[PDB]
């Protein structure tokens, strides 16, 4: 048996893992998206199932006012000690955020606690449980790493933060984790940046408090030295040890199109870690995270496939569905028209930093088909609803039903650099159901419509123009249902009977 990387696709950056007996749990960063910090579950490190989110409530994910793509939830760390799971991270820019927080749970599916604010703004806070102590390791935004000890109950520092080590020469020392393995305490961290020079490095000491000395086989993992490789910007790893004693790393990376641009976001990868004779870890001979590997020494456990169609025919919204900042439940219902997701477009659109009536999911494949049957009668030109390809608040493609010159129409509208650049309309019948459809390849999104007396490819757009390299920030594309009255509320609701999502990267 083998597996193909990546192990979790679509926007899933900054992976943090822990093993609790036969079960593995993993979290990734979410930024402005709610619920925050999804928790995935596996029994083989390869097949992952979404089971909850660490931040499923507005009191533990305050997001209002945060910037798209550079605000909200940054790298989380996930750990487990004495019947209790802990997730620590940083919230930047949300009204009511005090910076670094953690939340706890007995069940990793939830419910999680309200935040325990630790009282600083350090990025990439990490925790580890060693010798009956809860260590807190973070960078100091000045090239150095700070270690401290923390009371699990209160989040207060019992031993205060102090400098113990620093980065090893590379840009933006990030993502430090603390491990006690054999004779030594190890600080493993990321350097180089967000780009091609990203790498994981390690150092160790006889004592937690230093001094630390660098690995002679740095880096631990990087695709820096293979510019041909289909995976790039590999880094921000977290280690996990199995019951057979062997070691695996999860880390983030990108899958560029023609080696130039990435739009799906930073995804999660899996690589075997080997320790050399002197006690230093490395992935392979060269540190390169490969496309396929021999399977972990664990029994294969494939999860029941999620169906293509969400029929919106139960009271509980599927866990993959995602909102922008803190959603008011007043804009959506699965109750009010049973069998449909009812979306009520408000005055709010993307141009502010609160929560527009948007519900979407991560584009988890280059090649896909996404479609939705929607009932929407607009009464005036400002009113619209349909599907959106979102990169951020300034960059998104809108496949919407609206009213133009007393005709109900289907519209593809391309917004880039916060300006509308292209708009193409086709006339719909005055009433009746409309199937809106978005199909994707590595390079192109194609937008299609179907109704009574109306079926047509409406337009195309580039994946390149929504890519990280053009738009900046720390996110990747979401495809979602959308309604907005652009200054006014929509008169009528937009009712989505179903939503198909088909990933086709295997073929
Ligand atoms: Ca339905």
CATH C-level class of the largest domain is: Mainly Beta
Binned strand content: over 45%
Question: Helix- and strand-based class?
Answer: mainly beta
Tell how many strands the DSSP assignment holds. Answer: 39
Largest sheet: 8 strands, antiparallel
Indicate the CATH topology of the largest domain. Tachylectin-2, Chain A
Count of discrete domains: 2
CATH architecture of the largest domain: 5 Propeller
Keywords:
507 residues; mainly beta; Tachylectin-2, Chain A; Jelly Rolls; 2 domains; 6-stranded antiparallel sheet; 1 helix; 39 strands; globular; binds calcium ion; EC 3.2.1.55
Written account of the structure:
With 507 residues, the chain is mainly beta. 1% of the residues lie in helices and 48% in strands. The protein contains 1 helix and 39 strands. Strands 25, 27, 28, 30, 35, 36, 37 and 39 form an 8-stranded antiparallel sheet that branches. It has a 6-stranded antiparallel sheet with strand order 29-38-31-32-33-34, with no helix packed on it. Strands 7, 8, 9, 10 and 11 form a 5-stranded antiparallel sheet that branches. The longest helix is centred in the last third of the chain and has 4 residues. It is globular and about 75 Å long. It starts with a strand and ends with a strand. The structure holds calcium ion (CA). The site of calcium ion has 7 residues, from β39. This is Non-reducing end alpha-L-arabinofuranosidase BoGH43B. It comes from Bacteroides ovatus (strain ATCC 8483 / DSM 1896 / JCM 5824 / BCRC 10623 / CCUG 4943 / NCTC 11153).
């Amino acid at each position: 048996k083998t597996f193909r990387n990546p192990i979790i696709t679509g926007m899933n950056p900054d992976p943090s893992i822990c093993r609790v007996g036969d079960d593995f749990y993993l979290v990734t960063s979410t930024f402005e998206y709610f619920p925050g910090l999804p928790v995935y579950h596996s029994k083989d490190l390869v097949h992952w199932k979404l089971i909850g989110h660490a931040l499923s409530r507005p009191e533990n994910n305050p997001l209002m006012g945060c910037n798209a793509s550079t605000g909200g939830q940054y790298a989380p760390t996930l750990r487990y000690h004495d019947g209790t799971f802990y997730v620590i991270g940083t919230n930047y820019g949300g009204k009511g955020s005090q910076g670094v927080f953690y939340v706890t749970a007995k069940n990793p599916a939830g419910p999680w606690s309200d935040p325990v604010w630790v009282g600083n703004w350090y990025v990439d806070p990490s925790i580890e449980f060693i010798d009956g102590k809860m260590y807190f390791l973070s960078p100091d935004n000045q090239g150095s790493f700070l270690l401290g000890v923390m009371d699990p109950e209160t989040g207060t520092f019992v031993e205060a933060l102090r400098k113990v080590a620093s980065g090893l020469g590379g840009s933006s020392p990030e993502g430090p984790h603390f491990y006690k393995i054999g004779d030594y305490y190890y600080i493993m961290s990321a350097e180089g940046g967000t780009g091609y020079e990203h790498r994981e490095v390690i150092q160790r000491s006889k004592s937690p408090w230093g001094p630390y000395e660098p690995s002679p086989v740095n880096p631990v993992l990087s695709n820096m030295n293979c510019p041909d490789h289909p995976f790039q910007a590999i880094g921000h790893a977290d280690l996990v040890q199995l019951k057979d004693g062997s070691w695996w790393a999860v880390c983030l990376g990108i899958r560029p199109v023609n080696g130039k641009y990435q739009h799906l976001g930073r995804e999660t990868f899996l690589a075997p870690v080997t320790w050399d004779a002197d006690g230093w870890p490395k992935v392979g001979k060269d540190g390169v995270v490969q496309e396929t590997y021999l399977f972990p020494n664990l029994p294969s456990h494939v999860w029941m496939e999620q169906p293509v169609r969400d029929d919106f025919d139960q009271e509980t919204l599927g866990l993959d569905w995602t909102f922008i900042r803190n959603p008011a439940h007043s804009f959506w219902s699965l109750t009010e028209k049973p069998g449909s997701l009812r979306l009520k477009g408000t005055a709010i659109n993307f141009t502010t930093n609160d929560s527009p009536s948007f519900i979407g999911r991560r584009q988890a494949a280059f090649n896909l088909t996404a479609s939705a049957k929607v009932n929407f009668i607009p009464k005036v030109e400002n009113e619209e609803a349909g599907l959106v390809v979102r990169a951020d608040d300034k960059n998104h493609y809108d496949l919407l039903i609206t009213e133009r010159n007393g005709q109900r129409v289907a519209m593809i509208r391309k917004t880039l650099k916060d300006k509308v650049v292209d708009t193409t309309c086709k006339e719909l019948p005055a009433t009746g159901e409309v199937i809106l459809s978005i199909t994707a390849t590595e390079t192109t999104y194609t937008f299609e419509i179907k109704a009574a007396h109306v079926s047509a490819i409406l337009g195309t757009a580039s994946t390149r123009d929504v890519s990280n390299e053009v738009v900046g920030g720390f996110t990747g594309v979401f495809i979602g249902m959308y309604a907005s009255g652009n200054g006014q509320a929509n008169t009528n609701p937009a009712d989505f009977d179903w939503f198909d999502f088909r990933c086709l990267d295997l073929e």
